């Protein structure tokens, strides 16, 4: 509630300290920024009314959004003025996806407080989840007044992007995989190259999530062969790096769960999917759809026991059976 007061008493235009940054740029960004907020005003209010009906509020959410947007931009530019060359500084301040993502993230903060759920704001602004993802941590860090509940919200957004939304079709994540540290660093990367800080950072975090989640399920279910934890992870991680195509329009936890059943299967352990899914409903955000509605092929859906048999084994029979021979694949690092 303390940030909400700073916003309502604040202005709808950029600060004087903020505009100086705009003037220190080689290409003054101010008119393209301002036009961008105005141009976005229309589409926001439109789609906002297309869901909440006939109110005036759409206009009000957005103007608080804009108020946060400029506040944070100014906070963020304060660190980046020492970090970035003059030409990088200006490139940032004229970069459209940077602004789309900063504003989209301000707006999600207002929306969520006054609760149209995430990922609503991405569909409204036609912003890819993987581009939006890049702004979240730097946004949090630059707005010291976010409440706990709000921080937790942006992180649930971030985790859902890592777990699902970044892996949708047409997402730039797959483009970047084919080829192979602040938000400004990631937005300044050219679309055409070198190694991508965006991709490496994303995977680094995905692994920590996946392993953390996988770890939770293993301490509950797999203690009579506790060695299995590290084994399952090696398959899980090997699959995320080199068989990444299976995450297309899928969920990290679907891949997680198959790696569990497969590894205990090939070590001749009898422990069915039934115990896995029931125990998984107990994860902090688990929805049973994660395993009741799983995609197989060509837009046809079935339960997870079907995905494991028809899609997962097709690809990994070579890989999984490796784990039972006399020279099994070497163990993957546990993410820090």
mmCIF file of C-alpha atoms in Angstrom:
data_model
loop_
_atom_site.group_PDB
_atom_site.id
_atom_site.type_symbol
_atom_site.label_atom_id
_atom_site.label_comp_id
_atom_site.label_asym_id
_atom_site.label_seq_id
_atom_site.Cartn_x
_atom_site.Cartn_y
_atom_site.Cartn_z
ATOM 1 C CA UNK A 1 0.000 0.000 0.000
ATOM 2 C CA UNK A 2 2.962 2.382 0.285
ATOM 3 C CA UNK A 3 3.787 2.145 -3.413
ATOM 4 C CA UNK A 4 0.137 2.682 -4.323
ATOM 5 C CA UNK A 5 0.272 6.004 -2.497
ATOM 6 C CA UNK A 6 3.441 7.167 -4.254
ATOM 7 C CA UNK A 7 1.742 6.433 -7.592
ATOM 8 C CA UNK A 8 -1.593 8.215 -7.007
ATOM 9 C CA UNK A 9 0.159 11.399 -5.857
ATOM 10 C CA UNK A 10 2.623 11.220 -8.783
ATOM 11 C CA UNK A 11 2.542 12.737 -12.281
ATOM 12 C CA UNK A 12 1.634 11.228 -15.651
ATOM 13 C CA UNK A 13 4.719 12.632 -17.382
ATOM 14 C CA UNK A 14 8.392 11.739 -16.898
ATOM 15 C CA UNK A 15 10.285 13.391 -14.047
ATOM 16 C CA UNK A 16 12.856 16.154 -14.577
ATOM 17 C CA UNK A 17 15.665 13.832 -13.492
ATOM 18 C CA UNK A 18 14.352 11.206 -15.918
ATOM 19 C CA UNK A 19 14.195 13.590 -18.882
ATOM 20 C CA UNK A 20 17.830 14.625 -18.355
ATOM 21 C CA UNK A 21 18.704 11.013 -19.176
ATOM 22 C CA UNK A 22 16.624 11.388 -22.349
ATOM 23 C CA UNK A 23 18.729 14.472 -23.181
ATOM 24 C CA UNK A 24 22.008 12.731 -22.416
ATOM 25 C CA UNK A 25 21.150 10.212 -25.137
ATOM 26 C CA UNK A 26 22.700 10.593 -28.583
ATOM 27 C CA UNK A 27 19.268 9.923 -30.078
ATOM 28 C CA UNK A 28 16.775 11.633 -27.764
ATOM 29 C CA UNK A 29 14.163 8.912 -27.073
ATOM 30 C CA UNK A 30 11.446 11.148 -25.581
ATOM 31 C CA UNK A 31 9.037 11.495 -28.473
ATOM 32 C CA UNK A 32 9.168 7.819 -29.402
ATOM 33 C CA UNK A 33 8.686 6.872 -25.768
ATOM 34 C CA UNK A 34 5.731 9.224 -25.247
ATOM 35 C CA UNK A 35 4.005 8.281 -28.453
ATOM 36 C CA UNK A 36 4.480 4.652 -27.423
ATOM 37 C CA UNK A 37 2.623 5.139 -24.124
ATOM 38 C CA UNK A 38 -0.186 7.019 -25.877
ATOM 39 C CA UNK A 39 -0.411 4.489 -28.705
ATOM 40 C CA UNK A 40 -0.533 1.693 -26.124
ATOM 41 C CA UNK A 41 -3.193 3.556 -24.159
ATOM 42 C CA UNK A 42 -5.736 2.853 -26.882
ATOM 43 C CA UNK A 43 -5.209 -0.857 -27.226
ATOM 44 C CA UNK A 44 -5.039 -1.357 -23.449
ATOM 45 C CA UNK A 45 -8.343 0.409 -22.772
ATOM 46 C CA UNK A 46 -9.988 -1.382 -25.680
ATOM 47 C CA UNK A 47 -9.091 -4.936 -24.710
ATOM 48 C CA UNK A 48 -9.590 -3.936 -21.062
ATOM 49 C CA UNK A 49 -13.207 -3.071 -21.810
ATOM 50 C CA UNK A 50 -13.524 -6.207 -23.965
ATOM 51 C CA UNK A 51 -13.261 -8.183 -20.700
ATOM 52 C CA UNK A 52 -14.628 -5.994 -17.849
ATOM 53 C CA UNK A 53 -17.509 -4.565 -19.874
ATOM 54 C CA UNK A 54 -18.814 -1.003 -19.708
ATOM 55 C CA UNK A 55 -17.673 0.997 -16.676
ATOM 56 C CA UNK A 56 -13.172 4.430 -17.292
ATOM 57 C CA UNK A 57 -11.260 2.029 -15.120
ATOM 58 C CA UNK A 58 -9.200 0.800 -18.050
ATOM 59 C CA UNK A 59 -8.022 4.379 -18.379
ATOM 60 C CA UNK A 60 -7.225 4.438 -14.658
ATOM 61 C CA UNK A 61 -5.271 1.207 -14.416
ATOM 62 C CA UNK A 62 -3.193 2.318 -17.385
ATOM 63 C CA UNK A 63 -2.355 5.724 -15.986
ATOM 64 C CA UNK A 64 -1.091 4.170 -12.767
ATOM 65 C CA UNK A 65 0.868 1.705 -14.891
ATOM 66 C CA UNK A 66 2.384 4.609 -16.716
ATOM 67 C CA UNK A 67 3.251 6.184 -13.388
ATOM 68 C CA UNK A 68 5.137 3.103 -12.198
ATOM 69 C CA UNK A 69 6.709 2.640 -15.665
ATOM 70 C CA UNK A 70 8.405 6.039 -15.551
ATOM 71 C CA UNK A 71 9.368 5.699 -11.896
ATOM 72 C CA UNK A 72 11.103 2.367 -12.511
ATOM 73 C CA UNK A 73 12.692 3.392 -15.772
ATOM 74 C CA UNK A 74 14.281 6.228 -13.860
ATOM 75 C CA UNK A 75 15.491 3.874 -11.106
ATOM 76 C CA UNK A 76 16.799 1.469 -13.702
ATOM 77 C CA UNK A 77 18.554 4.083 -15.765
ATOM 78 C CA UNK A 78 20.472 5.015 -12.629
ATOM 79 C CA UNK A 79 22.390 1.778 -12.522
ATOM 80 C CA UNK A 80 22.697 1.505 -16.301
ATOM 81 C CA UNK A 81 24.291 4.906 -16.806
ATOM 82 C CA UNK A 82 27.487 3.536 -15.260
ATOM 83 C CA UNK A 83 27.176 0.157 -16.946
ATOM 84 C CA UNK A 84 26.526 1.095 -20.566
ATOM 85 C CA UNK A 85 28.429 3.006 -23.167
ATOM 86 C CA UNK A 86 26.855 6.161 -24.496
ATOM 87 C CA UNK A 87 25.732 4.350 -27.629
ATOM 88 C CA UNK A 88 24.329 1.390 -25.680
ATOM 89 C CA UNK A 89 22.518 3.783 -23.316
ATOM 90 C CA UNK A 90 20.738 5.443 -26.261
ATOM 91 C CA UNK A 91 20.043 2.146 -27.987
ATOM 92 C CA UNK A 92 18.333 0.945 -24.808
ATOM 93 C CA UNK A 93 16.186 4.054 -24.455
ATOM 94 C CA UNK A 94 14.975 3.730 -28.095
ATOM 95 C CA UNK A 95 14.454 -0.053 -27.957
ATOM 96 C CA UNK A 96 10.773 -0.887 -28.413
ATOM 97 C CA UNK A 97 10.729 -4.326 -26.792
ATOM 98 C CA UNK A 98 12.484 -2.966 -23.766
ATOM 99 C CA UNK A 99 9.755 -0.375 -23.388
ATOM 100 C CA UNK A 100 6.973 -2.838 -24.164
ATOM 101 C CA UNK A 101 8.292 -5.113 -21.434
ATOM 102 C CA UNK A 102 8.878 -2.426 -18.816
ATOM 103 C CA UNK A 103 5.400 -0.979 -19.312
ATOM 104 C CA UNK A 104 3.769 -4.379 -19.507
ATOM 105 C CA UNK A 105 5.408 -5.169 -16.167
ATOM 106 C CA UNK A 106 4.341 -1.934 -14.504
ATOM 107 C CA UNK A 107 0.824 -2.640 -15.748
ATOM 108 C CA UNK A 108 0.802 -6.178 -14.436
ATOM 109 C CA UNK A 109 1.767 -4.791 -11.017
ATOM 110 C CA UNK A 110 -1.237 -2.451 -10.938
ATOM 111 C CA UNK A 111 -3.665 -5.021 -12.357
ATOM 112 C CA UNK A 112 -2.678 -7.736 -9.929
ATOM 113 C CA UNK A 113 -2.859 -5.516 -6.877
ATOM 114 C CA UNK A 114 -6.359 -4.328 -7.871
ATOM 115 C CA UNK A 115 -7.577 -7.770 -8.916
ATOM 116 C CA UNK A 116 -7.237 -10.255 -16.557
ATOM 117 C CA UNK A 117 -4.693 -12.553 -14.982
ATOM 118 C CA UNK A 118 -1.164 -12.943 -16.167
ATOM 119 C CA UNK A 119 -0.553 -13.800 -19.048
ATOM 120 C CA UNK A 120 -3.410 -11.466 -19.974
ATOM 121 C CA UNK A 121 -1.161 -8.438 -20.377
ATOM 122 C CA UNK A 122 1.060 -10.275 -22.889
ATOM 123 C CA UNK A 123 -1.874 -11.111 -25.183
ATOM 124 C CA UNK A 124 -3.080 -7.537 -24.868
ATOM 125 C CA UNK A 125 0.276 -6.097 -25.929
ATOM 126 C CA UNK A 126 1.290 -8.941 -28.261
ATOM 127 C CA UNK A 127 4.517 -9.381 -26.239
ATOM 128 C CA UNK A 128 6.336 -12.725 -26.253
ATOM 129 C CA UNK A 129 6.646 -14.327 -22.816
ATOM 130 C CA UNK A 130 10.391 -14.836 -23.368
ATOM 131 C CA UNK A 131 10.909 -11.144 -24.133
ATOM 132 C CA UNK A 132 8.859 -10.144 -21.072
ATOM 133 C CA UNK A 133 10.741 -12.629 -18.890
ATOM 134 C CA UNK A 134 13.923 -10.668 -19.429
ATOM 135 C CA UNK A 135 12.642 -7.603 -17.508
ATOM 136 C CA UNK A 136 11.293 -9.150 -14.330
ATOM 137 C CA UNK A 137 14.370 -9.431 -12.033
ATOM 138 C CA UNK A 138 15.736 -5.995 -12.988
ATOM 139 C CA UNK A 139 12.241 -4.550 -12.444
ATOM 140 C CA UNK A 140 12.006 -6.035 -8.947
ATOM 141 C CA UNK A 141 15.519 -4.858 -8.118
ATOM 142 C CA UNK A 142 14.851 -1.280 -9.240
ATOM 143 C CA UNK A 143 11.560 -0.805 -7.353
ATOM 144 C CA UNK A 144 12.388 -1.063 -3.669
ATOM 145 C CA UNK A 145 8.737 -0.448 -2.686
ATOM 146 C CA UNK A 146 7.239 -3.595 -4.097
ATOM 147 C CA UNK A 147 5.372 -5.466 -1.411
ATOM 148 C CA UNK A 148 6.115 -9.076 -0.625
ATOM 149 C CA UNK A 149 2.882 -10.181 -2.215
ATOM 150 C CA UNK A 150 3.830 -8.312 -5.371
ATOM 151 C CA UNK A 151 7.370 -9.705 -5.601
ATOM 152 C CA UNK A 152 5.895 -13.181 -5.154
ATOM 153 C CA UNK A 153 3.535 -12.367 -8.016
ATOM 154 C CA UNK A 154 6.175 -11.353 -10.560
ATOM 155 C CA UNK A 155 8.111 -14.498 -9.603
ATOM 156 C CA UNK A 156 5.078 -16.732 -10.221
ATOM 157 C CA UNK A 157 4.913 -15.036 -13.600
ATOM 158 C CA UNK A 158 8.614 -15.707 -14.162
ATOM 159 C CA UNK A 159 8.379 -19.345 -13.088
ATOM 160 C CA UNK A 160 5.365 -19.920 -15.309
ATOM 161 C CA UNK A 161 7.264 -18.513 -18.273
ATOM 162 C CA UNK A 162 10.201 -20.773 -17.480
ATOM 163 C CA UNK A 163 7.854 -23.708 -16.979
ATOM 164 C CA UNK A 164 5.497 -23.252 -19.937
ATOM 165 C CA UNK A 165 5.018 -19.950 -21.681
ATOM 166 C CA UNK A 166 8.520 -19.464 -23.061
ATOM 167 C CA UNK A 167 8.162 -22.891 -24.726
ATOM 168 C CA UNK A 168 5.050 -22.083 -26.765
ATOM 169 C CA UNK A 169 5.352 -22.163 -30.545
ATOM 170 C CA UNK A 170 6.530 -18.938 -32.249
ATOM 171 C CA UNK A 171 8.397 -18.017 -29.055
ATOM 172 C CA UNK A 172 11.881 -16.623 -29.739
ATOM 173 C CA UNK A 173 13.314 -19.197 -27.319
ATOM 174 C CA UNK A 174 13.426 -21.918 -29.985
ATOM 175 C CA UNK A 175 15.013 -19.542 -32.497
ATOM 176 C CA UNK A 176 17.850 -18.939 -30.031
ATOM 177 C CA UNK A 177 18.265 -22.631 -29.195
ATOM 178 C CA UNK A 178 18.709 -23.416 -32.909
ATOM 179 C CA UNK A 179 21.810 -21.220 -33.156
ATOM 180 C CA UNK A 180 23.744 -22.534 -30.155
ATOM 181 C CA UNK A 181 23.730 -9.399 -16.650
ATOM 182 C CA UNK A 182 20.790 -7.034 -16.442
ATOM 183 C CA UNK A 183 17.568 -6.664 -18.401
ATOM 184 C CA UNK A 184 19.285 -3.956 -20.434
ATOM 185 C CA UNK A 185 22.026 -6.445 -21.360
ATOM 186 C CA UNK A 186 19.434 -8.889 -22.662
ATOM 187 C CA UNK A 187 17.444 -6.328 -24.633
ATOM 188 C CA UNK A 188 20.608 -4.933 -26.236
ATOM 189 C CA UNK A 189 21.577 -8.332 -27.658
ATOM 190 C CA UNK A 190 21.132 -8.233 -31.436
ATOM 191 C CA UNK A 191 18.670 -10.589 -33.023
ATOM 192 C CA UNK A 192 21.506 -11.735 -35.342
ATOM 193 C CA UNK A 193 24.953 -12.804 -34.120
ATOM 194 C CA UNK A 194 28.136 -15.074 -30.577
ATOM 195 C CA UNK A 195 26.510 -16.722 -27.508
ATOM 196 C CA UNK A 196 23.296 -15.267 -26.084
ATOM 197 C CA UNK A 197 23.294 -14.023 -22.505
ATOM 198 C CA UNK A 198 19.493 -14.358 -22.659
ATOM 199 C CA UNK A 199 19.532 -18.040 -23.531
ATOM 200 C CA UNK A 200 22.266 -18.994 -21.076
ATOM 201 C CA UNK A 201 20.624 -17.094 -18.241
ATOM 202 C CA UNK A 202 17.218 -18.594 -19.039
ATOM 203 C CA UNK A 203 18.462 -22.169 -19.044
ATOM 204 C CA UNK A 204 20.574 -21.573 -15.927
ATOM 205 C CA UNK A 205 17.413 -20.574 -14.096
ATOM 206 C CA UNK A 206 15.190 -23.222 -15.694
ATOM 207 C CA UNK A 207 17.519 -25.928 -14.384
ATOM 208 C CA UNK A 208 17.423 -24.537 -10.837
ATOM 209 C CA UNK A 209 13.621 -24.581 -10.915
ATOM 210 C CA UNK A 210 13.377 -28.010 -12.544
ATOM 211 C CA UNK A 211 15.879 -29.502 -10.130
ATOM 212 C CA UNK A 212 14.272 -27.817 -7.118
ATOM 213 C CA UNK A 213 10.858 -29.138 -8.160
ATOM 214 C CA UNK A 214 12.250 -32.559 -9.051
ATOM 215 C CA UNK A 215 14.058 -32.613 -5.707
ATOM 216 C CA UNK A 216 10.779 -32.072 -3.847
ATOM 217 C CA UNK A 217 9.163 -35.104 -5.489
ATOM 218 C CA UNK A 218 12.165 -37.404 -4.892
ATOM 219 C CA UNK A 219 12.430 -36.902 -1.116
ATOM 220 C CA UNK A 220 8.744 -37.774 -0.761
ATOM 221 C CA UNK A 221 8.634 -40.795 -3.084
ATOM 222 C CA UNK A 222 12.196 -42.165 -3.603
ATOM 223 C CA UNK A 223 14.068 -43.030 -0.399
ATOM 224 C CA UNK A 224 14.612 -46.840 -0.722
ATOM 225 C CA UNK A 225 16.903 -45.970 -3.650
ATOM 226 C CA UNK A 226 17.922 -42.376 -2.775
ATOM 227 C CA UNK A 227 20.700 -42.678 -5.358
ATOM 228 C CA UNK A 228 17.924 -42.252 -7.917
ATOM 229 C CA UNK A 229 17.664 -38.484 -7.324
ATOM 230 C CA UNK A 230 20.891 -37.672 -9.170
ATOM 231 C CA UNK A 231 20.133 -40.264 -11.859
ATOM 232 C CA UNK A 232 16.687 -38.840 -12.639
ATOM 233 C CA UNK A 233 18.154 -35.337 -12.827
ATOM 234 C CA UNK A 234 20.790 -36.403 -15.349
ATOM 235 C CA UNK A 235 18.069 -37.734 -17.654
ATOM 236 C CA UNK A 236 15.882 -34.684 -16.943
ATOM 237 C CA UNK A 237 18.689 -32.238 -17.711
ATOM 238 C CA UNK A 238 20.030 -34.221 -20.676
ATOM 239 C CA UNK A 239 16.523 -34.018 -22.135
ATOM 240 C CA UNK A 240 16.137 -30.266 -21.554
ATOM 241 C CA UNK A 241 19.425 -29.457 -23.324
ATOM 242 C CA UNK A 242 19.418 -31.769 -26.385
ATOM 243 C CA UNK A 243 15.823 -32.997 -26.764
ATOM 244 C CA UNK A 244 14.468 -29.542 -25.972
ATOM 245 C CA UNK A 245 12.018 -29.882 -28.871
ATOM 246 C CA UNK A 246 9.802 -31.985 -26.570
ATOM 247 C CA UNK A 247 9.015 -28.949 -24.397
ATOM 248 C CA UNK A 248 7.309 -27.234 -27.373
ATOM 249 C CA UNK A 249 3.791 -26.417 -26.086
ATOM 250 C CA UNK A 250 4.484 -28.567 -22.996
ATOM 251 C CA UNK A 251 5.327 -28.052 -19.250
ATOM 252 C CA UNK A 252 8.629 -28.522 -17.403
ATOM 253 C CA UNK A 253 6.849 -30.684 -14.849
ATOM 254 C CA UNK A 254 5.583 -33.046 -17.557
ATOM 255 C CA UNK A 255 9.168 -33.692 -18.594
ATOM 256 C CA UNK A 256 10.180 -33.851 -14.912
ATOM 257 C CA UNK A 257 7.653 -36.568 -14.120
ATOM 258 C CA UNK A 258 8.494 -38.822 -17.058
ATOM 259 C CA UNK A 259 12.198 -38.686 -16.196
ATOM 260 C CA UNK A 260 11.254 -39.968 -12.713
ATOM 261 C CA UNK A 261 9.136 -42.892 -13.887
ATOM 262 C CA UNK A 262 11.602 -43.848 -16.605
ATOM 263 C CA UNK A 263 14.717 -44.028 -14.423
ATOM 264 C CA UNK A 264 13.109 -46.181 -11.716
ATOM 265 C CA UNK A 265 11.598 -48.332 -14.498
ATOM 266 C CA UNK A 266 15.003 -49.143 -16.042
ATOM 267 C CA UNK A 267 16.486 -49.900 -12.598
ATOM 268 C CA UNK A 268 13.616 -52.453 -12.275
ATOM 269 C CA UNK A 269 11.802 -50.463 -9.602
ATOM 270 C CA UNK A 270 8.032 -51.046 -9.508
ATOM 271 C CA UNK A 271 6.514 -47.648 -8.648
ATOM 272 C CA UNK A 272 3.700 -46.550 -10.950
ATOM 273 C CA UNK A 273 2.679 -43.132 -12.235
ATOM 274 C CA UNK A 274 -0.274 -43.249 -9.837
ATOM 275 C CA UNK A 275 1.910 -42.429 -6.838
ATOM 276 C CA UNK A 276 3.709 -39.749 -8.840
ATOM 277 C CA UNK A 277 0.683 -37.711 -9.962
ATOM 278 C CA UNK A 278 -1.132 -37.847 -6.636
ATOM 279 C CA UNK A 279 2.046 -36.675 -4.882
ATOM 280 C CA UNK A 280 2.495 -33.954 -7.557
ATOM 281 C CA UNK A 281 -0.898 -32.358 -6.874
ATOM 282 C CA UNK A 282 0.842 -31.400 -3.620
ATOM 283 C CA UNK A 283 3.339 -29.046 -5.298
ATOM 284 C CA UNK A 284 2.722 -25.388 -4.437
ATOM 285 C CA UNK A 285 1.148 -24.505 -7.763
ATOM 286 C CA UNK A 286 0.203 -27.878 -9.207
ATOM 287 C CA UNK A 287 -2.995 -28.030 -11.246
ATOM 288 C CA UNK A 288 -4.102 -31.509 -12.154
ATOM 289 C CA UNK A 289 -4.425 -30.425 -15.789
ATOM 290 C CA UNK A 290 -0.598 -30.491 -15.851
ATOM 291 C CA UNK A 291 -0.917 -34.298 -16.043
ATOM 292 C CA UNK A 292 -4.569 -34.824 -17.054
ATOM 293 C CA UNK A 293 -4.247 -32.740 -20.244
ATOM 294 C CA UNK A 294 -0.891 -33.481 -21.913
ATOM 295 C CA UNK A 295 -0.188 -33.043 -25.644
ATOM 296 C CA UNK A 296 0.932 -36.117 -27.707
ATOM 297 C CA UNK A 297 1.265 -35.079 -31.444
ATOM 298 C CA UNK A 298 -0.374 -32.860 -34.159
ATOM 299 C CA UNK A 299 -2.672 -31.001 -31.612
ATOM 300 C CA UNK A 300 -4.103 -34.298 -30.144
ATOM 301 C CA UNK A 301 -4.292 -34.475 -26.293
ATOM 302 C CA UNK A 302 -4.293 -37.379 -23.775
ATOM 303 C CA UNK A 303 -3.097 -38.111 -20.238
ATOM 304 C CA UNK A 304 0.545 -38.198 -19.203
ATOM 305 C CA UNK A 305 0.726 -41.990 -19.106
ATOM 306 C CA UNK A 306 0.107 -41.786 -22.869
ATOM 307 C CA UNK A 307 2.762 -39.113 -23.482
ATOM 308 C CA UNK A 308 5.397 -41.258 -21.755
ATOM 309 C CA UNK A 309 4.621 -44.249 -23.970
ATOM 310 C CA UNK A 310 4.065 -42.612 -27.378
ATOM 311 C CA UNK A 311 6.350 -39.531 -27.444
ATOM 312 C CA UNK A 312 8.900 -39.771 -24.648
ATOM 313 C CA UNK A 313 10.174 -43.307 -25.314
ATOM 314 C CA UNK A 314 10.314 -42.799 -29.098
ATOM 315 C CA UNK A 315 13.189 -40.387 -28.553
ATOM 316 C CA UNK A 316 14.989 -41.605 -25.437
ATOM 317 C CA UNK A 317 14.981 -45.377 -25.672
ATOM 318 C CA UNK A 318 18.630 -45.104 -26.683
ATOM 319 C CA UNK A 319 19.172 -42.578 -23.889
ATOM 320 C CA UNK A 320 17.308 -44.162 -20.997
ATOM 321 C CA UNK A 321 18.589 -47.702 -21.564
ATOM 322 C CA UNK A 322 22.109 -46.265 -21.339
ATOM 323 C CA UNK A 323 21.535 -45.932 -17.562
ATOM 324 C CA UNK A 324 21.255 -49.715 -17.024
ATOM 325 C CA UNK A 325 24.414 -50.942 -18.748
ATOM 326 C CA UNK A 326 27.872 -51.354 -17.239
ATOM 327 C CA UNK A 327 28.961 -47.858 -18.397
ATOM 328 C CA UNK A 328 25.978 -45.569 -17.686
ATOM 329 C CA UNK A 329 26.118 -41.897 -18.739
ATOM 330 C CA UNK A 330 28.049 -39.641 -16.401
ATOM 331 C CA UNK A 331 26.152 -37.635 -13.802
ATOM 332 C CA UNK A 332 25.119 -34.032 -14.580
ATOM 333 C CA UNK A 333 26.034 -31.116 -12.284
ATOM 334 C CA UNK A 334 23.483 -30.059 -9.684
ATOM 335 C CA UNK A 335 22.577 -26.387 -10.360
ATOM 336 C CA UNK A 336 24.018 -23.919 -7.810
#
